[PDB]
Ligand binder design. Sequence first.
Ligand SMILES: O=C(O)C[C@@](O)(CC(=O)N1CCN(S(=O)(=O)c2cc3c(c(O)c2O)C(=O)c2ccccc2C3=O)CC1)C(=O)O
Ligand SMILES: O=C(O)C[C@@](O)(CC(=O)N1CCN(S(=O)(=O)c2cc3c(c(O)c2O)C(=O)c2ccccc2C3=O)CC1)C(=O)O
Ligand SMILES: O=C(O)C[C@@](O)(CC(=O)N1CCN(S(=O)(=O)c2cc3c(c(O)c2O)C(=O)c2ccccc2C3=O)CC1)C(=O)O
Ligand SMILES: O=P(O)(O)OC[C@H]1O[C@](O)(COP(=O)(O)O)[C@@H](O)[C@@H]1O
Ligand SMILES: O=P(O)(O)OC[C@H]1O[C@](O)(COP(=O)(O)O)[C@@H](O)[C@@H]1O
Ligand SMILES: O=P(O)(O)OC[C@H]1O[C@](O)(COP(=O)(O)O)[C@@H](O)[C@@H]1O
Ligand SMILES: O=P(O)(O)OC[C@H]1O[C@](O)(COP(=O)(O)O)[C@@H](O)[C@@H]1O
Ligand SMILES: O=C([O-])C(=O)[O-]
Ligand SMILES: O=C([O-])C(=O)[O-]
Ligand SMILES: O=C([O-])C(=O)[O-]
Ligand SMILES: O=C([O-])C(=O)[O-]
Ligand SMILES: [K+]
Ligand SMILES: [K+]
Ligand SMILES: [K+]
Ligand SMILES: [K+]
Ligand SMILES: [Mg+2]
Ligand SMILES: [Mg+2]
Ligand SMILES: [Mg+2]
Ligand SMILES: [Mg+2]
Lengths: 422, 425, 425, 435
Amino acid sequence: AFFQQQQLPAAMADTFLEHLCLLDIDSEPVAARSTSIIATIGPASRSVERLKEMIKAGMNIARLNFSHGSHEYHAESIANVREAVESFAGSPLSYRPVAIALDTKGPGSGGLSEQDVRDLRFGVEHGVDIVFASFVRKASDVAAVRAALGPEGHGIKIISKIENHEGVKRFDEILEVSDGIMVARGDLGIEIPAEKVFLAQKMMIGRCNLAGKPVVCATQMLESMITKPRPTRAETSDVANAVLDGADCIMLSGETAKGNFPVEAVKMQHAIAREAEAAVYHRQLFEELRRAAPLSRDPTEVTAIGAVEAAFKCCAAAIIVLTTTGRSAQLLSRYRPRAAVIAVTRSAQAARQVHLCRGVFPLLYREPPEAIWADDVDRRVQFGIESGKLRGFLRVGDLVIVVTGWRPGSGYTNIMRVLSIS
Amino acid sequence: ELGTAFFQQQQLPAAMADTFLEHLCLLDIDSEPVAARSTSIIATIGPASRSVERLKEMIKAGMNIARLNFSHGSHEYHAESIANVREAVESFAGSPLSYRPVAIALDTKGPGPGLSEQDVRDLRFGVEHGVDIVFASFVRKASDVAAVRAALGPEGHGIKIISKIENHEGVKRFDEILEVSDGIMVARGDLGIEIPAEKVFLAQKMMIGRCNLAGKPVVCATQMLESMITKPRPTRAETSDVANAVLDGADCIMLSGETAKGNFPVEAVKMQHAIAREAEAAVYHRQLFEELRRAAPLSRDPTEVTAIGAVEAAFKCCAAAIIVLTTTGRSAQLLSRYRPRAAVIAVTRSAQAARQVHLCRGVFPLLYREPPEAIWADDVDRRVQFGIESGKLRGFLRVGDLVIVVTGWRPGSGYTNIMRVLSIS
Amino acid sequence: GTAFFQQQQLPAAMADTFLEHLCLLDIDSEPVAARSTSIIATIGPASRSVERLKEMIKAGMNIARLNFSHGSHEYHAESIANVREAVESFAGSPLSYRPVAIALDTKGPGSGPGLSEQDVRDLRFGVEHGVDIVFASFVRKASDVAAVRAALGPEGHGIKIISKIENHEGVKRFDEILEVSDGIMVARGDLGIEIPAEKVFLAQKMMIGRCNLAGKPVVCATQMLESMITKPRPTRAETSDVANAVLDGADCIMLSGETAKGNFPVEAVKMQHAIAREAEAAVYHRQLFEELRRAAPLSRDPTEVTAIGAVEAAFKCCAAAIIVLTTTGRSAQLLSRYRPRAAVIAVTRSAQAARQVHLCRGVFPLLYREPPEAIWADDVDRRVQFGIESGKLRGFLRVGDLVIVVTGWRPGSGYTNIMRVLSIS
Amino acid sequence: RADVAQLTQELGTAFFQQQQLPAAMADTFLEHLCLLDIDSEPVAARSTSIIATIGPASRSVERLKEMIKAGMNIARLNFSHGSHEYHAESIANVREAVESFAGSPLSYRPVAIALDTKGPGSPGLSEQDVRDLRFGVEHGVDIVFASFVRKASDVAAVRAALGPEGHGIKIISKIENHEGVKRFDEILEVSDGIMVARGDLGIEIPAEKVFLAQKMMIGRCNLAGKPVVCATQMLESMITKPRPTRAETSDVANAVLDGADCIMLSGETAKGNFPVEAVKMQHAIAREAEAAVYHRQLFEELRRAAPLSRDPTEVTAIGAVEAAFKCCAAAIIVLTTTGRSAQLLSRYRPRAAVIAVTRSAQAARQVHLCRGVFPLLYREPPEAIWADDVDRRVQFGIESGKLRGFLRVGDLVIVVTGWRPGSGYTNIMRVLSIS
Ligand SMILES: O=C(O)C[C@@](O)(CC(=O)N1CCN(S(=O)(=O)c2cc3c(c(O)c2O)C(=O)c2ccccc2C3=O)CC1)C(=O)O
Ligand SMILES: O=C(O)C[C@@](O)(CC(=O)N1CCN(S(=O)(=O)c2cc3c(c(O)c2O)C(=O)c2ccccc2C3=O)CC1)C(=O)O
Ligand SMILES: O=C(O)C[C@@](O)(CC(=O)N1CCN(S(=O)(=O)c2cc3c(c(O)c2O)C(=O)c2ccccc2C3=O)CC1)C(=O)O
Ligand SMILES: O=P(O)(O)OC[C@H]1O[C@](O)(COP(=O)(O)O)[C@@H](O)[C@@H]1O
Ligand SMILES: O=P(O)(O)OC[C@H]1O[C@](O)(COP(=O)(O)O)[C@@H](O)[C@@H]1O
Ligand SMILES: O=P(O)(O)OC[C@H]1O[C@](O)(COP(=O)(O)O)[C@@H](O)[C@@H]1O
Ligand SMILES: O=P(O)(O)OC[C@H]1O[C@](O)(COP(=O)(O)O)[C@@H](O)[C@@H]1O
Ligand SMILES: O=C([O-])C(=O)[O-]
Ligand SMILES: O=C([O-])C(=O)[O-]
Ligand SMILES: O=C([O-])C(=O)[O-]
Ligand SMILES: O=C([O-])C(=O)[O-]
Ligand SMILES: [K+]
Ligand SMILES: [K+]
Ligand SMILES: [K+]
Ligand SMILES: [K+]
Ligand SMILES: [Mg+2]
Ligand SMILES: [Mg+2]
Ligand SMILES: [Mg+2]
Ligand SMILES: [Mg+2]
């Protein structure tokens, strides 16, 4: 029965063609949904009660579009998101972190606009986790956004939105200085011929997967759900294909900001992403990611590939990783393991931001610290196991891969262990 | 000899990549498509696209197959639409650069247990009106196809039956249905109501993959450009859906309400044409050909053996086209199953085969009407040169190009066994 | 039949990985195909008699090597005459006649910077006596090959120059030497003294791989069955060395003292024949063909394009043979570079080309002696029928087999462009 | 180039020109062959073990010290010749020559002692074999090369004749005839490893078919993760000549490229005029051939073919080998009691040396059967705290590694350990930087 679920017959195929031939509508997804859902918060999804339903439906990142509303309006939305999120902190083995992303208005006819400088300052003051920088055309646009975030906003992730021909042509220099990319198909579909957007999307997703950096697929994914309770056949296909292309995140704009079915749109993206993640041909994907990833003498990078290889060898239910900044979880995520990457962190901000990396399930550690650092690490690993059991990721008898470091502090990941559950 | 400019067009840098991941990384929005659009467009003919003048614009925009949905209208209404399609098609017989065969497909209302009374009458209407294809609704098992086949009376055994898979049973019994059908339609409208909407993409990818492996045509249908029923431009999900159907391996893409009743029928055809051309150049032929080769069983049929040799030869020299002589369309279909990048120019005397080969990706039919030469080898050479001169006229070929020419050793269908490499003079 | 698929290591041939291919090799799976790696036998006192040379031709000797490091011009002229007498003794039965090449192996440069004056005289003797191949000793750079070519003069333009790589400089300048040579000999005797003995296998494997990639003949030479100079059976290392030279991709394997001066010249030829047949069936064609195709550049030469199409067609149907008409041997060489499992039966009127194509693995030359038919197409057909009749007599073909036939569109060399699938009747 | 650019800037272009690294990075086997370079020098320690037959030409303690220095890892005693007294004296001389270097862990070299049986002659285990096997147990031999194994019951008979005191002895079944080849799978299943005995095999089956049997058995042993020895006439002419033939060097190189864990010398060391030179020649060829292995395809094929495993030692071994390839690790240091954790690393054919730290003198000798395993015998008494004892053993491996030239400051090493004492609990992989 285990080998009939999660498209495992299609996963064992010797060619991509045979893998497609073996895809089965009766093979149910079992693994947790790996692709994060970004929901735009607006009039239809602002209330605390509505936000609780959206968190339960699967929203991982709340996007505030600074092209609309005001600072007062967006601060109220942020407060409602935080109130809805913290309303679940009662059960420590089930709490779900939710990131807050600020999407800028953009430069318009002009460097960094004066409104963007003020909105970026608002983001820093309100503790946003991510900035989706509109109309990034070159590396210097990213540097300007980074400067406007100042010294207090050093830890904020900058996801550059590629929205025009110049951004596509200068993609490599933009990706080099950004934390990640957003394929902003709305403007891209007006800036370049509409029939070429899929080439830009597939190229950028492939290059971000190669670089090990997050990539978001955005705009009109479930557009008809703004007024209708069910999406079109093209819309479900678009969501599934963004996941199969390799997108770390999928986004909802008007579907959640102003539409009549915000919760249903999140549930639809969740249901499609789960099905599409099981349909990924890991045999080819892992081999290609492995071959293309450069040789490295960084112990975190070396441990990450060893851990992902070990996870595939035993059909590991999860890879539990201890991380301060999210980096060790990101390096595991770049190899696209089928095993969930359960990231146990004390940083509330890192827990929110690792939603940008596919297959990373953040757990915020809130238990008393042990006197012995070796015993503290073991408590954090046991926390990951207990949360995993409660959430359905793990069961007694499962094998897990545990990734830890040799000394406290960020940058010292170097250990992989094979653990049997209970 | 060819030039660096040649190797920058039609996603040739992405085509040379050693992995699928590197192929995606090399896709370039500035690399322009050069080859003719190979995925056929099926347009549903209804009130918005019924007039002879509108049909001429749809043919110019790229419509290859006219679909008549017998779930709506009447026999009289559909006969008038068929007459208008044939009048619009024959209005271009005076210009070789514009004349294009257009197939006529009848889409049945559907089943009750067996074949419905109305379907028996509509299938009889199809035979009497000389339709080329039947899109059989709600095919659930092999016996449903046999019933449709039996209904195509004594005169319609040459009509292609494309079985529409619209529910759980059709998906589960897919292999037995494909075995007795000429092809498959992934009918996503009903499929998305019969099975969970989030599972339709799995059924689509599986059926397209299995049809590609069997060498049989597969149509992707329903809501591909849905918003274009009321809007002049499609959504980002819609253009992606059309491109991904082509990348999945679909031989045909379809328009339903977009052309039957919408405000932008011609624009919807133009949009499918533009997207399919871009998507066909983005196909990773290096892996596709290797996998089609490895999965296809060994064959002692000369047509099949010649077809793989011709496709291998075409890739080796970047041949502008593979010109094939065919009476039934079968030799062109066997070339199409290996997904050559070279256009398959099929020269035929059969007007029906010319219309029907639109079901096979990359087949460009040329109907030949010259009287037969007394010496067969001369009649063969005349048809080969007709394909080259039509190719030159349409932009497929230029002097100095290499073409692969597929023929047989004796007249009559079923004897293809020769592949030749010709330099265009 | 199931019996067909158990022979010639076909279970190992279908394996999905090289490791599984090795695991499926079966000592009970008998070789069926004709031996495709040519055997070069050095002529000396143990192999000079006309009667002994007839036994060596029957055992499998394809090329007779004359070693100009020993004996006078008078001795080599008698060797040539004896070889020709033994070869022409079988000319009375044209369907079974086996051409045998005569290769001249030069003394070399010695302490000098390039072409010696003895080499100049010996090379002129070769042209005057009609040698087919020169094995140029101690080639260190491209200018050494040009000097050999100049010493052959205007009458020796058709002689093949196989450069012997025997020292460090030759290995380091390999690419420039291969570019101007017709092929290479891995001369392991001197190579094993010029470079560390434990490195010779790396030089052998590298040069064989680069010659396979270039589509040029490579010979593996020296001490392959050394112990058979005095013993009737070889050592375990010797049989392994011959099998591994074939698995590496060598077109030819050589015997030196084993046939020139040893006690078992005929047995040494029979042993190389038996090993080579076993090793050729053990070649993992699935990976080899895929790698040869991926590495071979795109080509606009119709002979090369037809050759890859013909090899692809032959693999698709398990063709017993590829029958090719050739004037210079070039069309057969271009088929051979893709390493088909099907035997390449080359029909030619050129006695020299028939001898020289032995340098290419899997090419079986047939010398056609009939004068040309008045109708060119009939002359082509008669030559194809001669290939079929010789093939049936020799065991290559049977009624019911499929063969691929490669011909051209006009008389004269350079116009191969047609591939055809023929059923043997 | 992009997959090696940062590491090329760090380690240098000179590093990437040695040990056939340009051929190792090739995308196809054909391009890998085209990139093999006679100027690319081997750097890694020789990983294929050399089995030398001990006889009249190689029996003296002084000669044996030269053979150990030349590279002999396993001393074979052929019970088809000599007597119990003769073989006991050879064993004592091997042990005296081996223990003469026991003054330091950076000079000590464990050497296994293998007993090769006479065989059954004309069906069951012969009476002479029962006595010779009893001699082996009494003299503490590490391995038995069982002659003419034809079926699984032949290896059970050898195991029974070894008795309750010889349970730890490795049984390597010699495949010497058609029946042994045909019943190979059942024989490998119950044996510790295999020997392709080409001498008898070349007389029992057609000589032109021996290479098929050799390549098939080596491939199946590689797939099973069990040791395979290539034997007989590898350097035959070196019995009387100081240099081998071109076919002989090719045969040794091709046995290593085929996947043999061990290569053997018979008359070359037992009775020949150049025993030390024959060992040196096998050492030099094996080092060149190991660097020429196309690891990219080999590792991918070993992974595709190996079934999924829920054994933590197996899971840790593949993770450690993957990690070693990612950073061009100089070594994988593994703690082992029986040799099993080192054997599971060896089955994935890492380019990194597997330095196996063990307290078992017998396991240190027996791991020579596994390609790429370098045994270090740890002699210190156990620390009070087990975690400290583990750390001391890992540091012993690092210090021996530095002293012997396997490791340098700045190198990355992979360290493989377990969660509790005792055999069977390996489950940890660590990446350590050498300081
Ligand atoms: O800036 C650009 O480059 C272009 C553009 O303005 C395009 C545009 O006009 N759009 C229409 C509005 N939608 S929306 O329905 O998703 C949407 C609507 C609203 C808000 C959004 O954040 C939002 O994203 C509010 O914040 C919001 C706040 C207060 C009251 C109402 C709302 C609200 O109606 C997005 C697309 C854009 O922004 O891309
Ligand atoms: O049969 C089924 O199982 C379900 C269904 O009936 C579903 C359905 O009701 N649909 C609404 C109509 N569209 S349509 O806009 O594409 C479309 C509309 C019309 C016609 C169509 O052929 C047609 O396909 C006429 O022939 C037509 C003829 C005469 C007057 C008007 C029209 C016309 O308005 C298709 C979807 C179907 O058929 O799938
Ligand atoms: O029974 C078999 O399986 C067949 C066979 O006996 C074949 C055979 O006869 N051989 C000849 C002898 N060689 S040998 O030169 O390597 C060699 C020679 C001698 C010894 C060997 O162990 C030995 O291996 C002594 O122990 C030895 C001890 C005391 C005095 C002299 C010697 C000595 O001359 C091996 C091959 C075999 O064993 O395969
Ligand atoms: O992923 P990051 O940011 O590098 O953090 C990983 C770090 O987490 C640890 O596992 C635990 O560190 P802390 O005790 O500081 O939480 C370190 O050993 C390791 O260096
Ligand atoms: O694809 P089909 O229907 O088998 O037709 C292929 C046939 O066409 C030809 O090339 C030409 O035949 P005709 O002259 O009868 O048209 C035949 O030699 C070959 O058998
Ligand atoms: O292999 P080559 O030397 O190019 O010769 C091939 C030539 O042989 C032919 O098949 C027959 O030519 P001939 O009639 O002159 O022998 C030509 O059509 C073709 O060009
Ligand atoms: O390879 P083996 O035979 O399983 O031995 C590995 C064992 O060695 C250890 O690393 C150390 O064990 P000891 O302390 O008993 O020597 C164990 O944790 C592990 O189980
Ligand atoms: O801003 C966006 O999200 C877009 O344009 O797609
Ligand atoms: O009938 C159709 O076309 C459908 O259901 O999608
Ligand atoms: O010249 C040769 O043949 C040699 O050196 O091997
Ligand atoms: O017994 C042996 O070692 C042999 O036959 O090779
Ligand atoms: K915005
Ligand atoms: K219908
Ligand atoms: K010579
Ligand atoms: K013995
Ligand atoms: Mg935008
Ligand atoms: Mg329907
Ligand atoms: Mg020489
Ligand atoms: Mg023996």
